[PDB]
Symmetry: D2
Subunit: 481 residues, 4 copies
């Protein structure tokens, strides 16, 4: 058990402490080799073959970089080797809870399969970390390297999911508050997890990363702000932070919310739903779970990866025929067809509980156009996407503190108007995409007229292509011209 | 004279037609090897050693890529080899008019040295091109390769500077209107010149380029818009175009308007002004010109490059002592000191004719603080920066036309609200930076009080570090807290 | 059916003709999404998650770039749109025959599972291409776009596997000879397939690519050489070609033959062998095949991918326990243990047909040392690695033709001595690595003594680390 | 001062200690902004605009990286902050002695202008460092930061040039021997200076770097070898070190010895020689120096940069006409024409004293061919290039020591045959290029016949194009087949 050096295409030669190596070399961690970072995105961007495993190594790496840099510049913070290891472990382990095709699983499949349960990848990561520790005898190894497992396990979990229940954390005291801002920053979202995915996703997607995390690290300091020690940025770096969030939004627009990538995730989800009654996953004590219930038993969940897609695709069981056929149609590129995109106007914000009513609404629209085919609710898919700066309607830069060159330990606030008038006025929006499951030319024509009529009825924005797809519907709305 | 291959670190292996090689291998073109692309920026970003020469090769290259792509996808446009060569030549030659330290010359020095003249690098490029053609016997070579010099020289100049002044161009007819949108796009600023400098400046600065010009080319088409053939983008590329302009603005913020780079350009300009009566540049017929009059004689201007800085720095003439001393202080990094930055609020805009009144205004401010030193007008520099999307207050994307996949010959418009609510609400602003020529601690303290008081008096934005630099001044303004 | 644009991180925005899209959007092609390019290498280089699919797109792309460039510079070659499409198709389809974990399958598993059969990924690619065409109704689509399936299918297969057996090809005549040097260059190995994998593997591994393929394309021309039209390089580029091969050898040394990646491929192969009676793959007419017999039915082979590893790993059947346990030990990083390395001396080379006798040989060695444990044949792995410039002992640059700037239609040869005295004197060598499946300290000690004795018996080089 | 951050395109965000900033901000250091790293190479590779300044920053950076890494892993070496600063200063300052166009100056111009003197850039760097320190009051600043100038200046100079006259060094004792292997490694050439130029030259040239220096650092240790502490590599790195030298040789072949770049350096050298009697450079006490004598006065040398090229090019003095005309012909790309390349056969180098006899020999060749025009010795340029692995005929890897991970304190040797049979058999060779100053087609034809005949007469290798350029001459030589 000495340190290992690993060559990563993003970060280069990265050192892994032997405790980290012990954690990595387990079935619970290695599982992440079989879960694509971007899920259905690979079916649009063929470079995006990268998995959650290598992203996890990068996050643990960068978590160590930031905590080491803070400690080197400010010995007065009393950051210990124990603290550094705990932060690196949380960075390494904060992706353990992801399921097949990453956000497809927690974002689309579980909400539909198990609408009563409240599952997040964060909670999954806590449960899987616990399973990893207990199944692999990691506690005596933590101890060997100076950790105190009771307190430090708690600290690691809290970094992943937040307070496990006035300073709300139990794993560390307030004087180490800043340590909770490294791995998953619940105050403003500025964390090393974003820095790794920006660089790594860009490298694989073939889109170029404009955020410089190493610069950020160089300019980062810990300061007291309203009685608490926070990571603060240099004042003049504020434009770079606005640009960090702009980068995140552009990656979502270009890649993660690609309209075809989304429909592929939707089809895969549909296949998994049709397969869920028939695939069995053996868990603890030989008990049997489903795709949708493996989340209840970490032994079963350990065996739940992107393999499920191929188990379905390669199946011969007649009960899996309908699931298998959806996947086959993905392979033939016989996809549900994209009809268009619109946005709500104003403060209007469509809620998750209304999502199911939307396809009916589209099908109930009455376009004043000559139509052969008539479409029903079940022929439409309506995908609602929330785009924001990570704090719903809030500006995350209002939740950052800065320091000046003349007083580096003295935290200040910077308002948006002190920065630029070219910045966003709003920090959250919704995109609404409509697709049609009938793919012939007459059905697509019809779907376009229902869609643009529905936009007009709901006072949503004019589709970008609306004059071309629905020339007889767009003139009715004077707000559109 | 066959086709020559050149290896460029941005574009790779580029082919140059023999006519282009003939144009490049002249003193008028080769001059651009001695003019830094980013001028004083090298003194802040040590990677930014690149010159106007290699940028020009890249612009010529990309101009050819775009015109070739358009011709290949749309044979009906009747783009000829002659058209391709003329576009490549304009792309190659549109930087011929730059002077020492590029934007320092036309942006700072000429306005101060020759306030009566209206000089632009574009006009310079036309004059230098004409000089290059006539001095090197290029016309019979244009002819050899199928160009018609009268029409084609006119066409090339018009691409560079616009109409030489109802269709206002003489070099080509309206059926080739789109050709004028390649090299210098006066309609919306989307041109190949930006594409080269984004990539090349980023390469040298150590900042990563987020705009994909090759994608843009792939999706570009020519469509009829209001009776004219224009280059149009695919509808779904609109976000990428908003991002192109965001990229340009971020490069200005991080690099081109760096507060120290600007003060260095200011000092160099001051040295050139103090040198201008004494440096001689020999032009046509042995006539002598000054730095400020070389623009009147292309033979003298051919010899006016960044060398002027070293001629001053290395001089022994006592008449050049004052100019030389400024440059010496740059080498010792004894720079004028940055006092702070502010912005006017709203649509309020300081104009070029007011620039000279500003240091007097700062010096006339009456901070209610005990001050040891008192400062005069001549102790202050006030640098006003216009940041915009290239069309003053206008949104350039309102001046782009798009096409849809279902009707690729049908041009449409797309409004900002049809795209995203996270986009800029304004497309222009001004930054005001103040510096002090006296660099001792008491003078800098005093300068900061005058500055912040002036900001408060004029209702400009609170300096980002205002509470730290001027804690007794910031409390007066309740909007600042 | 218009052109599609696809964004690749290596090549950028690549255009795909609609016929190519039709070929790509099949189960036979899409399968390649589930086969890692570098197999076991991912378990050493965590960036090496890339699959054969994206590599195939890149090869099709570069095949089109080269044939287009040649056509543009030399209209006299009469390269047609039909020729361009056929070259792009061969480039796209020359990886169809790869099996689970790529070289693990054809290099390690099939030789052990089916020692009587003579399988290559090239032959596999031809069989899978034919399966793809016939199962998906591609022929009437080729016709719609002006291809002639009889001649063109033949031409595509020949680009992949060589003559299907005087000009030995049937798909094109000798006046289009040069077209056969693009996708898989059997004359000297300079082909677009290498160019894509250098760039793509380097991108994923985190090692930087030395070779400039775009330069090569720019300087490539077709010239008559001994009555045949061949792709020739500019004379001045000869150093760059020696460097192309050096690049290939460095990628093998650093990555593809990494000693840990190799032992992982060896363990996976061992798990597949132990699983082979129990994993079932359904083929044509509902017939069932094994991992080792899926190659006998393309419908079954279509469903044979890296998934097999997870099917084994996630299995609960006691019949699969031994296979499953090997894969489990990979996850715990409990690997078969490296014992040592040696080389034959001179041009001496151990041949593929002797590979299976080698572990028995090591186990039969009689070291004159005090040895506690005794080991059997099945406890040893002996991995023979051929490092060469792609033509066994030959210098591939002796099989390249060049042209000079003063006579661009005149092909010449360039010898090694005309280039540099710093070049390799030899173009092939063999490395022999030995590992032990018993990993305790006494067994490893013993394995080392048998190994060094075997080296002495065979007159191999003295192992390092005495 | 505090710590300054500089953004470098190769290394990213680099920290400079304030003592380093004081050294950099001097006329003697800033001078390196005006000296191209690759000289005439820019006239072939337009990306190669980079100067000695930014390379020096990178070398100082990497010198600090390596010495820091060694100290962190091996506290027993007693590397002090003082040692780290001294190593960084030597790294920073080891390019101070370069002259106009870098290797053109010490490699071509000084040998011809001052054949009696033995000038090297290393000696120049020592003299310039001394001048920098004394002219800028650096000693009291060294002292402020804990350095001891007497010992430490000596140490810095010794790192640059080697022993200034049994352990031969005075700046540090034998127990810090390894510190002399960082900046300029005279034992085997493995130093940080190569690592910076590999990366930086590749970035600018547009050729990709295949050497990973960060990996090397990770695997580097100090071990005792034959009673001395040396930097040693892990055993596994041996292949990578052979490849590092292969990389260096390939960069020389592709770029630094480009046949056209070399002829351009030759023409510039010729221009400088013709200018040398007439250009004046003012040195200490107003004394005047020439281009060839500025090396004798550091105050004059401080003002001797690439500017000399433009001073000549822009001159009007009739005495400079002949120099100026050569430079003008470079601008028109009227270059001496490349005739061909050959190599000597067998073992003994052609020596420098025979170089002058070579053009005569070529002109005296008697090709048995009909030739109308006849050429003289002075129409030929013969450029002899020594290509090697940095230790003449020796294999530098025979001078590296390695360690195995289970015995990291035991240094061993690894022989070529223990690595691969595919490695070079020889480590040094000569390339001979011939050019003709007469550029018409009949003269070039003739030059080619003389050249190939001369190759045959001297038993040199067959030119690659020999059968095409000289079809009547190549049949005579049975060794050519
Ligand atoms: C850039 C580069 N170049 C190499 N020559 C090279 N050799 C191995 N790697 C990569 O380094 C990482 C460490 O592999 P490495 O081979 O250095 O270490 P090992 O653990 O196999 O050997 P040992 O030190 O235990 O004896 C791995 O991600 C990958 F192999 C390399 N990466
Ligand atoms: C990446 C790379 N690799 C090379 N081996 C290499 N050799 C030359 N270059 C670069 O190519 C460009 C063309 O140089 P090249 O040497 O091909 O042109 P030349 O004019 O010297 O030869 P010729 O055709 O007239 O006989 C130039 O920018 C630079 F030399 C290279 N770039
Ligand atoms: C660098 C870059 N930037 C983007 N904004 C961007 N958007 C899509 N891509 C990528 O281009 C490729 C084409 O995607 P694209 O979105 O252009 O094609 P589509 O088939 O969805 O649209 P349509 O023309 O059929 O309406 C794909 O590999 C990936 F989606 C992008 N790549
Ligand atoms: C990648 C990147 N992004 C930036 N936003 C950015 N701003 C400055 N730089 C670059 O960092 C380096 C340091 O610039 P910086 O502006 O941090 O230093 P300063 O000396 O002007 O500020 P202060 O600390 O004295 O107030 C320099 O090489 C260049 F300006 C940037 N580089
Ligand atoms: Na920052
Ligand atoms: Na910014
Ligand atoms: Na224009
Ligand atoms: Na100059
Ligand atoms: Na056939
Ligand atoms: Na072939
Ligand atoms: Na079948
Ligand atoms: Na699977
Ligand atoms: Na290259
Ligand atoms: Na190394
Ligand atoms: Na190597």
């Amino acid at each position: 058990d000495t340190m290992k050096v690993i060559n990563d295409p993003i970060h280069g030669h990265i050192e892994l402490h032997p405790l980290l190596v012990r954690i990595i070399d387990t079935p619970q961690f290695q599982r992440l080799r079989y879960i694509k970072q971007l899920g259905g995105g690979y079916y649009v961007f063929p470079g995006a073959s990268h998995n959650r495993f290598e992203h996890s190594l990068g996050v643990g790496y960068l978590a160590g970089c930031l905590v080491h840099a803070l400690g080197e510049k400010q010995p007065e913070l009393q950051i210990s080797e124990r603290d550094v290891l705990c932060v690196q472990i949380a960075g390494l382990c904060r992706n353990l809870g992801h399921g097949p095709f990453s956000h497809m699983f927690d974002g689309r499949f579980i909400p539909l399969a198990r609408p009563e349960v409240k599952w997040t990848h964060e909670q999954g990561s806590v449960m899987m970390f616990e399973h990893l520790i207990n199944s692999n005898g990691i506690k005596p190894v933590m101890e060997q390297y100076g950790l105190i497992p009771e307190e430090d396990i708690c600290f690691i979990k809290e970094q992943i999911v937040g307070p496990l229940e006035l300073w709300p954390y139990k794993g560390r005291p307030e004087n180490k508050s800043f340590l909770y801002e490294i791995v998953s920053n619940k105050r403003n979202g500025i964390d090393v997890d974003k820095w790794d995915y920006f660089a790594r996703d860009c490298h694989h997607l073939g889109i170029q990363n404009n955020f410089d995390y190493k610069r950020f690290i160089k300019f980062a300091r810990v300061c007291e702000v309203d009685n608490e020690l926070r990571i603060c940025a240099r004042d003049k770096e504020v434009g770079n932070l606005y640009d960090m969030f702009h980068t995140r939004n552009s990656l979502h627009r270009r890649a993660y919310q690609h309209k075809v990538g989304n429909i592929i995730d939707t089809m895969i989800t549909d296949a998994f739903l049709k397969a869920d009654d028939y695939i069995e996953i053996t868990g603890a004590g030989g008990k049997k779970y489903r795709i949708s219930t493996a989340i209840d038993d970490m032994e079963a969940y350990t065996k739940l990866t992107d393999n499920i897609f191929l188990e379905i695709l390669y199946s011969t069981d007649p009960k899996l025929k309908d699931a298998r056929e959806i996947l086959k149609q993905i392979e033939y590129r016989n996809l549900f067809k994209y009809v268009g995109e619109t946005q709500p106007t104003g403060q209007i914000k469509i809620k998750r509980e209304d999502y199911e009513s939307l396809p009916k609404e589209v099908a109930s629209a009455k376009p004043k156009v000559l139509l052969d085919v008539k479409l029903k609710a079940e022929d439409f898919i309506v995908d609602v996407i929330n785009m924001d700066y990570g704090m719903q309607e809030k500006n995350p830069i209002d939740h950052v503190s800065f320091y000046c060159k003349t007083a580096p330990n003295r935290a200040i606030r910077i308002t948006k108007n002190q920065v630029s008038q070219l910045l966003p006025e709003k920090f959250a929006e919704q995109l609404i995409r409509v697709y049609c499951k009938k793919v012939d030319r007459k059905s697509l024509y019809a779907a376009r007229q229902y869609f643009v009529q529905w936009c007009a009825d709901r006072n949503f924005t004019k589709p970008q292509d609306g004059d071309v797809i629905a020339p007889l519907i767009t003139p009715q709305k004077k707000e559109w011209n």
